[PDB]
């Protein structure tokens, strides 16, 4: 660990079920003691085939660095566009450059966006 090591996704898009929406998804990372100081945390949004299984890598739609300071100790990441129906989640894995080994991934819980006139 180090100064910036404890950014956690403490808040996120609260659809949590079958919701029909055109919306930009977001996740909020709070540094719970270990303040973001050295560099920036790397994130990537995934299209997950299933939300009831342990979320997996391979499908990436959006990605970048957290950066956005929505509060002195609060950071935010969002999708650059309002997306089509599907299952999404944010996969952040510590500061950029850090070898992703030893369970360094933190998933935002899979939020589902639908678009269905049913």
PDB file of C-alpha atoms in Angstrom:
ATOM      1  CA  UNK A   1       0.000   0.000   0.000  1.00  0.00           C
ATOM      2  CA  UNK A   2       0.843   3.691  -0.066  1.00  0.00           C
ATOM      3  CA  UNK A   3      -0.689   7.163   0.221  1.00  0.00           C
ATOM      4  CA  UNK A   4      -3.240   6.748  -2.573  1.00  0.00           C
ATOM      5  CA  UNK A   5      -4.015   3.075  -1.968  1.00  0.00           C
ATOM      6  CA  UNK A   6      -7.513   3.197  -0.424  1.00  0.00           C
ATOM      7  CA  UNK A   7      -9.905   4.642  -3.004  1.00  0.00           C
ATOM      8  CA  UNK A   8     -13.166   2.702  -2.760  1.00  0.00           C
ATOM      9  CA  UNK A   9     -16.323   2.843  -4.832  1.00  0.00           C
ATOM     10  CA  UNK A  10     -18.608   4.015  -2.043  1.00  0.00           C
ATOM     11  CA  UNK A  11     -21.440   5.259  -4.248  1.00  0.00           C
ATOM     12  CA  UNK A  12     -22.665   4.415  -7.730  1.00  0.00           C
ATOM     13  CA  UNK A  13     -25.644   4.416 -10.091  1.00  0.00           C
ATOM     14  CA  UNK A  14     -28.642   3.160  -8.111  1.00  0.00           C
ATOM     15  CA  UNK A  15     -30.857   1.506 -10.704  1.00  0.00           C
ATOM     16  CA  UNK A  16     -30.447  -1.951  -9.172  1.00  0.00           C
ATOM     17  CA  UNK A  17     -32.863  -3.939 -11.284  1.00  0.00           C
ATOM     18  CA  UNK A  18     -34.783  -3.715 -14.526  1.00  0.00           C
ATOM     19  CA  UNK A  19     -34.994   0.023 -15.089  1.00  0.00           C
ATOM     20  CA  UNK A  20     -35.547   1.600 -18.473  1.00  0.00           C
ATOM     21  CA  UNK A  21     -33.386   4.672 -18.775  1.00  0.00           C
ATOM     22  CA  UNK A  22     -31.204   6.702 -21.093  1.00  0.00           C
ATOM     23  CA  UNK A  23     -28.555   7.571 -18.536  1.00  0.00           C
ATOM     24  CA  UNK A  24     -24.845   8.077 -17.965  1.00  0.00           C
ATOM     25  CA  UNK A  25     -23.506   5.678 -15.362  1.00  0.00           C
ATOM     26  CA  UNK A  26     -21.293   6.819 -12.511  1.00  0.00           C
ATOM     27  CA  UNK A  27     -19.245   5.531  -9.621  1.00  0.00           C
ATOM     28  CA  UNK A  28     -17.927   7.542  -6.702  1.00  0.00           C
ATOM     29  CA  UNK A  29     -14.603   6.621  -5.139  1.00  0.00           C
ATOM     30  CA  UNK A  30     -13.829   7.787  -1.637  1.00  0.00           C
ATOM     31  CA  UNK A  31     -10.357   7.601  -0.128  1.00  0.00           C
ATOM     32  CA  UNK A  32     -11.106   6.009   3.227  1.00  0.00           C
ATOM     33  CA  UNK A  33      -7.930   7.120   4.952  1.00  0.00           C
ATOM     34  CA  UNK A  34      -5.407   6.775   2.176  1.00  0.00           C
ATOM     35  CA  UNK A  35      -5.776  10.010   0.212  1.00  0.00           C
ATOM     36  CA  UNK A  36      -5.257  10.139  -3.552  1.00  0.00           C
ATOM     37  CA  UNK A  37      -1.882  11.875  -3.817  1.00  0.00           C
ATOM     38  CA  UNK A  38       0.685  10.100  -5.999  1.00  0.00           C
ATOM     39  CA  UNK A  39      -1.114   9.397  -9.270  1.00  0.00           C
ATOM     40  CA  UNK A  40      -4.562   8.623 -10.668  1.00  0.00           C
ATOM     41  CA  UNK A  41      -6.677   5.481 -10.373  1.00  0.00           C
ATOM     42  CA  UNK A  42      -7.500   3.622 -13.569  1.00  0.00           C
ATOM     43  CA  UNK A  43     -11.062   2.576 -14.308  1.00  0.00           C
ATOM     44  CA  UNK A  44     -12.878   0.804 -17.109  1.00  0.00           C
ATOM     45  CA  UNK A  45     -16.579   0.183 -17.676  1.00  0.00           C
ATOM     46  CA  UNK A  46     -17.581  -3.337 -18.616  1.00  0.00           C
ATOM     47  CA  UNK A  47     -20.538  -4.824 -20.423  1.00  0.00           C
ATOM     48  CA  UNK A  48     -21.316  -7.854 -18.280  1.00  0.00           C
ATOM     49  CA  UNK A  49     -23.216 -10.813 -19.706  1.00  0.00           C
ATOM     50  CA  UNK A  50     -24.630 -11.634 -16.277  1.00  0.00           C
ATOM     51  CA  UNK A  51     -25.116  -9.608 -13.099  1.00  0.00           C
ATOM     52  CA  UNK A  52     -25.656 -12.572 -10.779  1.00  0.00           C
ATOM     53  CA  UNK A  53     -22.200 -13.987 -11.385  1.00  0.00           C
ATOM     54  CA  UNK A  54     -18.757 -12.731 -10.299  1.00  0.00           C
ATOM     55  CA  UNK A  55     -18.114  -9.940 -12.766  1.00  0.00           C
ATOM     56  CA  UNK A  56     -15.457 -10.577 -15.365  1.00  0.00           C
ATOM     57  CA  UNK A  57     -12.989  -8.683 -17.531  1.00  0.00           C
ATOM     58  CA  UNK A  58     -12.839  -8.644 -21.316  1.00  0.00           C
ATOM     59  CA  UNK A  59     -15.640  -6.304 -22.324  1.00  0.00           C
ATOM     60  CA  UNK A  60     -14.597  -2.701 -21.925  1.00  0.00           C
ATOM     61  CA  UNK A  61     -16.688   0.185 -23.188  1.00  0.00           C
ATOM     62  CA  UNK A  62     -15.265   3.230 -21.429  1.00  0.00           C
ATOM     63  CA  UNK A  63     -12.016   3.755 -19.533  1.00  0.00           C
ATOM     64  CA  UNK A  64      -9.632   6.328 -18.148  1.00  0.00           C
ATOM     65  CA  UNK A  65      -8.506   7.822 -14.870  1.00  0.00           C
ATOM     66  CA  UNK A  66     -10.731   8.907 -11.993  1.00  0.00           C
ATOM     67  CA  UNK A  67      -9.338  12.455 -11.584  1.00  0.00           C
ATOM     68  CA  UNK A  68     -12.737  14.153 -11.019  1.00  0.00           C
ATOM     69  CA  UNK A  69     -12.841  15.715  -7.561  1.00  0.00           C
ATOM     70  CA  UNK A  70     -16.501  16.054  -6.538  1.00  0.00           C
ATOM     71  CA  UNK A  71     -15.426  16.595  -2.958  1.00  0.00           C
ATOM     72  CA  UNK A  72     -12.187  17.177  -1.050  1.00  0.00           C
ATOM     73  CA  UNK A  73     -12.044  13.460  -0.277  1.00  0.00           C
ATOM     74  CA  UNK A  74     -14.499  12.263  -2.900  1.00  0.00           C
ATOM     75  CA  UNK A  75     -13.854  11.290  -6.518  1.00  0.00           C
ATOM     76  CA  UNK A  76     -16.231  10.407  -9.357  1.00  0.00           C
ATOM     77  CA  UNK A  77     -16.164   8.493 -12.635  1.00  0.00           C
ATOM     78  CA  UNK A  78     -18.916   8.499 -15.242  1.00  0.00           C
ATOM     79  CA  UNK A  79     -19.619   7.201 -18.716  1.00  0.00           C
ATOM     80  CA  UNK A  80     -18.968   9.731 -21.476  1.00  0.00           C
ATOM     81  CA  UNK A  81     -22.365   8.978 -23.017  1.00  0.00           C
ATOM     82  CA  UNK A  82     -25.846   7.708 -22.159  1.00  0.00           C
ATOM     83  CA  UNK A  83     -25.710   4.045 -23.107  1.00  0.00           C
ATOM     84  CA  UNK A  84     -27.943   1.454 -24.717  1.00  0.00           C
ATOM     85  CA  UNK A  85     -29.653  -1.353 -22.701  1.00  0.00           C
ATOM     86  CA  UNK A  86     -27.385  -3.885 -21.030  1.00  0.00           C
ATOM     87  CA  UNK A  87     -25.540  -4.834 -17.857  1.00  0.00           C
ATOM     88  CA  UNK A  88     -22.684  -2.564 -16.822  1.00  0.00           C
ATOM     89  CA  UNK A  89     -20.169  -2.229 -14.012  1.00  0.00           C
ATOM     90  CA  UNK A  90     -17.023  -0.255 -13.232  1.00  0.00           C
ATOM     91  CA  UNK A  91     -13.792  -2.183 -12.790  1.00  0.00           C
ATOM     92  CA  UNK A  92     -11.237  -0.088 -10.963  1.00  0.00           C
ATOM     93  CA  UNK A  93      -7.938  -1.751 -10.117  1.00  0.00           C
ATOM     94  CA  UNK A  94      -5.788   0.544  -7.999  1.00  0.00           C
ATOM     95  CA  UNK A  95      -3.502   3.371  -9.363  1.00  0.00           C
ATOM     96  CA  UNK A  96      -2.514   3.120 -13.024  1.00  0.00           C
ATOM     97  CA  UNK A  97       0.671   1.119 -13.471  1.00  0.00           C
ATOM     98  CA  UNK A  98       0.059  -1.135 -10.490  1.00  0.00           C
ATOM     99  CA  UNK A  99       0.293  -4.845 -11.489  1.00  0.00           C
ATOM    100  CA  UNK A 100      -3.213  -6.312 -11.298  1.00  0.00           C
ATOM    101  CA  UNK A 101      -2.330  -9.361  -9.222  1.00  0.00           C
ATOM    102  CA  UNK A 102      -3.504 -10.414  -5.784  1.00  0.00           C
ATOM    103  CA  UNK A 103      -7.156  -9.438  -6.213  1.00  0.00           C
ATOM    104  CA  UNK A 104      -6.535  -5.758  -6.903  1.00  0.00           C
ATOM    105  CA  UNK A 105      -9.857  -5.299  -8.677  1.00  0.00           C
ATOM    106  CA  UNK A 106     -12.871  -3.556  -7.218  1.00  0.00           C
ATOM    107  CA  UNK A 107     -16.179  -3.921  -9.021  1.00  0.00           C
ATOM    108  CA  UNK A 108     -19.070  -1.531  -8.874  1.00  0.00           C
ATOM    109  CA  UNK A 109     -22.186  -3.660  -8.392  1.00  0.00           C
ATOM    110  CA  UNK A 110     -23.727  -4.477 -11.785  1.00  0.00           C
ATOM    111  CA  UNK A 111     -26.336  -1.919 -12.753  1.00  0.00           C
ATOM    112  CA  UNK A 112     -28.756  -2.787 -15.508  1.00  0.00           C
ATOM    113  CA  UNK A 113     -30.124  -0.306 -18.001  1.00  0.00           C
ATOM    114  CA  UNK A 114     -33.039  -1.400 -20.119  1.00  0.00           C
ATOM    115  CA  UNK A 115     -35.017   0.207 -22.920  1.00  0.00           C
ATOM    116  CA  UNK A 116     -38.259  -1.665 -23.424  1.00  0.00           C
ATOM    117  CA  UNK A 117     -41.792  -0.526 -24.147  1.00  0.00           C
ATOM    118  CA  UNK A 118     -43.403  -3.681 -22.851  1.00  0.00           C
TER     119      UNK A 118
END
